[PDB]
Enzyme design. Structure first.
Site, PDB file in Angstrom:
ATOM      1  N   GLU A  35       0.705  -1.565  -0.183  1.00  0.00           N
ATOM      2  CA  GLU A  35      -0.285  -0.037   0.372  1.00  0.00           C
ATOM      3  C   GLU A  35       0.920   1.164  -0.143  1.00  0.00           C
ATOM      4  O   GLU A  35       0.285   2.341  -0.350  1.00  0.00           O
ATOM      5  CB  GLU A  35      -0.886  -0.475   0.983  1.00  0.00           C
ATOM      6  CG  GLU A  35      -1.967  -1.245   1.181  1.00  0.00           C
ATOM      7  CD  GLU A  35      -3.454  -0.647  -0.093  1.00  0.00           C
ATOM      8  OE1 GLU A  35      -3.149   0.623  -1.046  1.00  0.00           O
ATOM      9  OE2 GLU A  35      -3.760  -1.751  -0.666  1.00  0.00           O
ATOM     10  N   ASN A  46      -7.233   9.353  -6.486  1.00  0.00           N
ATOM     11  CA  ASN A  46      -8.046   8.271  -7.230  1.00  0.00           C
ATOM     12  C   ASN A  46      -9.080   9.496  -8.168  1.00  0.00           C
ATOM     13  O   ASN A  46      -9.539  10.380  -8.038  1.00  0.00           O
ATOM     14  CB  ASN A  46      -9.471   8.054  -5.979  1.00  0.00           C
ATOM     15  CG  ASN A  46      -8.501   6.822  -4.815  1.00  0.00           C
ATOM     16  OD1 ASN A  46      -7.950   5.978  -5.286  1.00  0.00           O
ATOM     17  ND2 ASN A  46      -8.858   6.916  -3.800  1.00  0.00           N
ATOM     18  N   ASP A  48     -12.012   9.809  -8.640  1.00  0.00           N
ATOM     19  CA  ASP A  48     -13.297  10.193  -8.171  1.00  0.00           C
ATOM     20  C   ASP A  48     -13.308  10.564  -7.621  1.00  0.00           C
ATOM     21  O   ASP A  48     -13.850  11.523  -6.880  1.00  0.00           O
ATOM     22  CB  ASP A  48     -14.223   9.123  -7.694  1.00  0.00           C
ATOM     23  CG  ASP A  48     -13.045   8.238  -6.097  1.00  0.00           C
ATOM     24  OD1 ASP A  48     -12.399   9.056  -6.432  1.00  0.00           O
ATOM     25  OD2 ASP A  48     -13.896   7.699  -5.656  1.00  0.00           O
ATOM     26  N   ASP A  52      -6.070   8.130  -0.907  1.00  0.00           N
ATOM     27  CA  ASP A  52      -6.142   7.919   0.134  1.00  0.00           C
ATOM     28  C   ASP A  52      -4.705   8.008   0.928  1.00  0.00           C
ATOM     29  O   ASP A  52      -3.616   8.889   0.301  1.00  0.00           O
ATOM     30  CB  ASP A  52      -5.364   6.267  -0.682  1.00  0.00           C
ATOM     31  CG  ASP A  52      -6.572   5.837  -1.332  1.00  0.00           C
ATOM     32  OD1 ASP A  52      -8.283   6.232  -1.229  1.00  0.00           O
ATOM     33  OD2 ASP A  52      -6.163   4.677  -2.648  1.00  0.00           O
ATOM     34  N   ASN A  59      -8.624   6.073   2.997  1.00  0.00           N
ATOM     35  CA  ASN A  59      -9.255   6.810   1.729  1.00  0.00           C
ATOM     36  C   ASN A  59     -10.387   7.594   2.208  1.00  0.00           C
ATOM     37  O   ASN A  59     -11.284   7.413   3.710  1.00  0.00           O
ATOM     38  CB  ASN A  59     -10.710   5.621   1.089  1.00  0.00           C
ATOM     39  CG  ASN A  59     -10.749   6.163  -0.163  1.00  0.00           C
ATOM     40  OD1 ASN A  59     -11.288   7.788  -0.021  1.00  0.00           O
ATOM     41  ND2 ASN A  59     -10.645   5.616  -1.244  1.00  0.00           N
TER      42      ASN A  59
END
Ligand SMILES: C[C@@H](O)CN1CCN(CC(=O)O)CCN(CC(=O)O)CCN(CC(=O)O)CC1
Ligand SMILES: C[C@@H](O)CN1CCN(CC(=O)O)CCN(CC(=O)O)CCN(CC(=O)O)CC1
Ligand SMILES: [Cl-]
Ligand SMILES: [Cl-]
Ligand SMILES: [Cl-]
Ligand SMILES: [Gd]
Ligand code: NA
Length: 128
Positions: A35, A46, A48, A52, A59
């Site tokens: 990660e 991201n 949208d 993160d 998120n």
């Protein structure tokens, strides 16, 4: 902060993460490596508009507030900026809520594709 493998394991183990919801300590070190590369300061945008944050890349859509994710929830009740600290307390307490929420550690896409079904114990091998 960039964490050592043994150093992170001892810290996750001290914050109670070891066997949390039946997930052995190796699953958690596994997830952090892929990660963030053990880096508390990692950020990833991201498509949208959500972001993160930190070692487990938590998120902004559901879990914390960065003031730029419109009509989003803050179910950890924390600024996202707190998830970037050298102190992983915030990130661990926040993760305890996520992994408890119905979908377990599948919420982490890199755990699902790179740790799930592997020799995860390998990740704490050699540590005291
Ligand atoms: C502990 C030593 O292994 C340190 N290490 C020596 C070099 N190694 C040789 C080897 O791993 O036998 C090869 C390169 N290595 C590949 C990999 O490990 O995936 C990436 C860099 N590593 C990452 C890490 O180990 O945390 C740090 C340097
Ligand atoms: C060349 C070696 O580095 C081979 N290595 C296997 C043996 N390693 C060695 C070690 O890290 O001492 C121990 C287990 N290892 C722990 C970790 O590195 O974090 C996870 C698996 N790694 C993943 C990776 O390297 O990215 C596969 C490659
Ligand atoms: Cl393990
Ligand atoms: Cl927001
Ligand atoms: Cl589960
Ligand atoms: Gd390795
Ligand atoms: Na939010």
């Amino acid at each position: 902060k960039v964490f050592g493998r043994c150093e992170l394991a001892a810290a996750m183990k001290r914050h109670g993460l070891d066997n949390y919801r039946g997930y052995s300590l190796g699953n958690w070190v596994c997830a952090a490596k892929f990660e963030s590369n053990f880096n508390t300061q990692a950020t990833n945008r991201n498509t949208d508009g959500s972001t993160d944050y930190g070692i487990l890349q938590i998120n902004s859509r559901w879990w914390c507030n960065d003031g730029r994710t419109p009509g989003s929830r803050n179910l950890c009740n924390i600024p996202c900026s707190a998830l970037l600290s050298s102190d992983i307390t915030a990130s661990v307490n926040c993760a305890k809520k996520i992994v408890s929420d119905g979908n377990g550690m599948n919420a982490w896409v890199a755990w699902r594709n790179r740790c799930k079904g592997t020799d995860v114990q390998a990740w704490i091998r050699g540590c005291r």
